[PDB]
Design a binder for this molecule. Sequence first.
Ligand SMILES: NC(=O)C1=CN([C@@H]2O[C@H](COP(=O)(O)OP(=O)(O)OC[C@H]3O[C@@H](n4cnc5c(N)ncnc54)[C@H](O)[C@@H]3O)[C@@H](O)[C@H]2O)C=CC1
Ligand SMILES: NC(=O)C1=CN([C@@H]2O[C@H](COP(=O)(O)OP(=O)(O)OC[C@H]3O[C@@H](n4cnc5c(N)ncnc54)[C@H](O)[C@@H]3O)[C@@H](O)[C@H]2O)C=CC1
Ligand SMILES: O=CNC1CCCCC1
Ligand SMILES: O=CNC1CCCCC1
Ligand SMILES: [Zn+2]
Ligand SMILES: [Zn+2]
Ligand SMILES: [Zn+2]
Ligand SMILES: [Zn+2]
Lengths: 374, 374
Amino acid sequence: STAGKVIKCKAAVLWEEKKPFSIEEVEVAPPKAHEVRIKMVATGICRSDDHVVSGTLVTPLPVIAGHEAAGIVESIGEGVTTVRPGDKVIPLFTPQCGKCRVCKHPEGNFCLKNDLSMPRGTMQDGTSRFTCRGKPIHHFLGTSTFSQYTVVDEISVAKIDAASPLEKVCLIGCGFSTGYGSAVKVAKVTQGSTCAVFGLGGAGLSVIMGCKAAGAARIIGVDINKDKFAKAKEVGATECVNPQDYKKPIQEVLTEMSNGGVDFSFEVIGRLDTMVTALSCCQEAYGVSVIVGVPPDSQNLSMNPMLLLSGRTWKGAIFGGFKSKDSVPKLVADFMAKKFALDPLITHVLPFEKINEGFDLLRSGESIRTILTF
Amino acid sequence: STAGKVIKCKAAVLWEEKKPFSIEEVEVAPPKAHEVRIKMVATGICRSDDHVVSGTLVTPLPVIAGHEAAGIVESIGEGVTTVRPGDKVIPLFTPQCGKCRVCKHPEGNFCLKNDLSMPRGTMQDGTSRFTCRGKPIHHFLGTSTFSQYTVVDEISVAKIDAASPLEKVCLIGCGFSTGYGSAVKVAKVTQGSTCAVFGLGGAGLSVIMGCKAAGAARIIGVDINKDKFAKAKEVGATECVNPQDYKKPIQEVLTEMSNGGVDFSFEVIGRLDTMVTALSCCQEAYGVSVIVGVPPDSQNLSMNPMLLLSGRTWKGAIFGGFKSKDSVPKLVADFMAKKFALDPLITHVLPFEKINEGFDLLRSGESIRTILTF
Ligand SMILES: NC(=O)C1=CN([C@@H]2O[C@H](COP(=O)(O)OP(=O)(O)OC[C@H]3O[C@@H](n4cnc5c(N)ncnc54)[C@H](O)[C@@H]3O)[C@@H](O)[C@H]2O)C=CC1
Ligand SMILES: NC(=O)C1=CN([C@@H]2O[C@H](COP(=O)(O)OP(=O)(O)OC[C@H]3O[C@@H](n4cnc5c(N)ncnc54)[C@H](O)[C@@H]3O)[C@@H](O)[C@H]2O)C=CC1
Ligand SMILES: O=CNC1CCCCC1
Ligand SMILES: O=CNC1CCCCC1
Ligand SMILES: [Zn+2]
Ligand SMILES: [Zn+2]
Ligand SMILES: [Zn+2]
Ligand SMILES: [Zn+2]
């Protein structure tokens, strides 16, 4: 009864930076060839969505943000072969086209069809499926999940187990998989190692889960908000340190605690200074540091290249290094088999209509993940 | 006739920065416990020695520089078990104590006993074995090979094949092993990959040798001195580019040439700008860039961390990642088995007395390696 027709529904439109989202009616076009229209069931509030509001992450406005979500296929465009109406699905903010040099590479996952490097805020075809007040509205990372319905390209959606609890597995669309993969796939944390994790939010707690699954002997959580320490320990941190408690720079503290530097460090905040601090705190000859946090737009860090010449490895990754369409269904299957837990990340639940209150909870420091239900 | 006695011999003393080496008599004390006195046979002129003259690399002056060399043991102090008088040896500018956390780690080689990070210019015991005109003279990287005789700690010397040609294998003490290992051990260049090598001197040509040995399909040499291109192609470069020939930044040129970025890049110059350029020219999702060049003292580079967040890996290494005492004898054995060539790196052979002429050849761009013979 809606296939092939424009759908009028509610979405959270961001009309300008540093303002609340506007919950209002939008018009969602039917899917074109190789596109999929999805009825959203749950969406998470991720810090990267807040980065759009703050101007930290630049993407064209006005926009429908949201990228961590799960829903049910309402209709498919011509030529779609990988999902059907009624399937449970997770939108993929990093696509997997399967045909570019990155998708064919055994390690790479940052598909060249992504809308992150040079953001257009459109579908793959350069157009938008959203209208509000008669005005076209931009998409976000090819997902735009802050809406009762969205349209995504086929390369940006994965079919998942039909029995999946969508109000939990939406975290596999961003925060969990990013942190977990950063530890187990990107850093490749080894058994018995010492790890330092900077930032104990949704993504940082998932890094800790990955370090524990990898068998690390020590996992040092670092955060300036000591209220984050209790949950960090519950999911595997062996100790937590607040840089504000020390008279010395925390890289010096961490080097002393690890008797010469840590095996693996992770920056899971998004600050230039903590990116350099995290690199510095890993052991100078064989340490590995992984950047996960999103830096402020167009800003350069400053560092001494002798930190690398001694032997350190520095790398970063999107989405924990996972090839998105291959990995999301397998991660859901592992969740269904109890191989990892998502409940520790979910601190608050709200209806979609209270999205602004959910962003208030994130900004105040009180929440890890708020899940919004449509 | 010299064991247990002070030796008066010829050495090249650097009394202050930005001056020629002073060829004059020095006194070399006999070795203390766990020390080895070596009669030098051949020593190479490496850019890192010139960095001491220029102030690029800070180490205490006055100094006997030189670190790439081979010689014959004249005497050993009490407790030495790994070399004997008469053995052919290569001094190790990176020690291998075998007891520190780095030496025990399967991948680390920057032994904590090194004199690089916080240069003292002494023996391990904090004193010097050199006197000139009655004044104590500093050591350099625990080696100090610009002298007819030197004294090194046991952890900074490796015994090599008694049939080795010392006027060639001295290059295993620095330039060859650094470049070769940077490709085959640090970067782990893969078969069929595309590589870019910035800087076509002794170390850069050895990187090329390693990339070819690893089966790279394309090896792009980059140098502002087009006179370096012929030898680079002889040792494996498939193409060479001079950044001064282009109106665009070379990172953009290399990205176009490689249809989206190279698999492996190497900075083998020692400039902050080319370190960032080399990182940028590797493929954004899976490329690897290795810093080999020594940066000017105390200077920071500036870079956008999004270059790493997309998926790039950035690392550096000392001495090609090789555990020094384990690796040097094995590399000599490989050379004797004809597994690699050193003659392509040697452009000039001069008597030690012509050390300053040898540095003039390096500074003018004319030489790759000048070998000085004692
Ligand atoms: N690379 C990728 O694919 C992804 C990147 N991100 C980015 O990772 C970062 C973390 O995301 P979330 O965990 O969702 O955000 P979050 O805001 O919940 O967690 C950040 C934590 O860092 C702490 N913090 C802030 N400043 C600090 C400082 N100077 N020192 C120590 N701790 C500090 C905060 O107290 C907070 O607990 C964000 O920048 C996000 O945009 C998130 C998921 C995907
Ligand atoms: N990491 C380690 O263990 C070692 C580091 N090094 C360092 O590697 C670097 C190279 O050493 P060598 O090969 O012996 O020196 P080299 O001086 O013979 O080679 C440097 C090359 O870079 C070229 N070059 C200079 N500026 C350039 C620019 N803007 N753009 C492109 N090319 C440029 C020069 O024309 C020259 O051919 C030095 O900084 C050296 O101190 C050397 C061996 C050990
Ligand atoms: O949070 C999800 N995606 C992020 C990934 C890093 C760049 C900004 C967008
Ligand atoms: O060239 C030999 N050794 C170099 C190693 C990198 C720092 C300066 C000295
Ligand atoms: Zn792709
Ligand atoms: Zn996210
Ligand atoms: Zn050691
Ligand atoms: Zn050298």
